[PDB]
């Protein structure tokens, strides 16, 4: 009742997506609901999803953690790179300040270029604005 299946089910209910793939596990976090708007200020009114992802990441205490920031197509390219870098960096220090060792964590920001949906449409660019957390 306090296990991994329950915390990914309430992570689904707090609308953070979670994909198991082999040894890789990847969290997909909406920046539109889990960040203040166009800023690396965290949306701390959406704290219990962030408490759920640190409760999820406590289960896997030896893996290298890639974290990565993603935007949509709007703005300048340097603005997308810097803002995606900043959102990945403040998610990295949230994990480091909520109890991950500093060399498992690795932050990288990509200015929209991996692009898990298209950016020519409204709900697709909303799905583009995300934070990828890969760990093993």
């Amino acid at each position: 009742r306090d296990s991994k299946r329950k915390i990914i089910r309430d992570l689904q209910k707090q609308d953070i997506q979670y994909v198991e793939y082999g040894d890789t596990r990847t969290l997909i976090i909406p920046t539109d609901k889990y960040f203040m708007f166009s800023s690396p200020r965290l949306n701390e009114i959406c704290y219990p999803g962030l408490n759920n992802v640190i409760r999820l990441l406590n289960f896997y205490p030896q893996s290298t953690i890639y974290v990565a920031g993603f935007t949509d197509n709007v703005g300048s390219r340097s603005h997308k790179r810097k803002l995606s870098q900043a959102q990945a960096e403040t998610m990295m220090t949230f994990l480091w300040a909520n109890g991950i060792a500093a060399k498992r964590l690795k932050a990288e920001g990509y200015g929209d270029k991996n692009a898990i949906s298209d950016n020519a449409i409204i709900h697709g660019s909303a799905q583009n604005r995300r934070i990828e957390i890969q760990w093993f």
Binding site: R9, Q12, Q17, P30, D32, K33, V74, I122, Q127, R130
Partner: protein, 138 residues
């Protein structure tokens, strides 16, 4: 159970097609910013004419859309600076619209000085306490 992550509020189509008009006007405007900043290099800033100061590092968060004089007089009145103008005011009002959040008054007056392009100019003399607004000579 299957759920893609961003489930926001229900939008409507006015905001949808205003948004996809706005992205075309945004990247055409940054295309224009690219060609203008490469055909003339901006050689100088305006921090050498508006330097930072003590009680100019007080912060402010401004939305404003009227003329420049009430805004700069309020910036200088909360900055504890004597505000003065040079030049008589043009008959068309020089309008700015500063919409920003939580920065200091030195870069607020630098944004006022940039938004008043070739119409007015903000100078700050921080040896004394003068915020000065100059209009142009046309």
């Amino acid at each position: 159970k299957f759920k893609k992550p961003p489930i926001n509020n229900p939008s409507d189509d006015a905001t949808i097609k205003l948004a996809e008009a706005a992205v075309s006007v945004s990247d055409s405007m940054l295309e224009m910013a690219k060609v203008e900043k490469v055909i003339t290099p901006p050689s100088k800033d305006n921090t050498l004419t508006i330097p930072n100061a003590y009680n100019l590092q007080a912060r402010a968060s401004v939305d404003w859309s009227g003329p420049i004089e009430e805004l700069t007089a309020r910036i200088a009145k909360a900055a504890h600076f004597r505000f003065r103008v040079l030049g008589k005011s043009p008959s068309v009002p020089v309008l700015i619209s500063i919409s920003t959040k939580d920065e200091s008054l030195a870069e607020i007056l630098r944004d006022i000085d940039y938004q008043a392009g070739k119409k007015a100019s903000i100078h700050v003399y921080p040896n004394s306490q003068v915020v000065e607004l100059r209009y142009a000579k046309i």
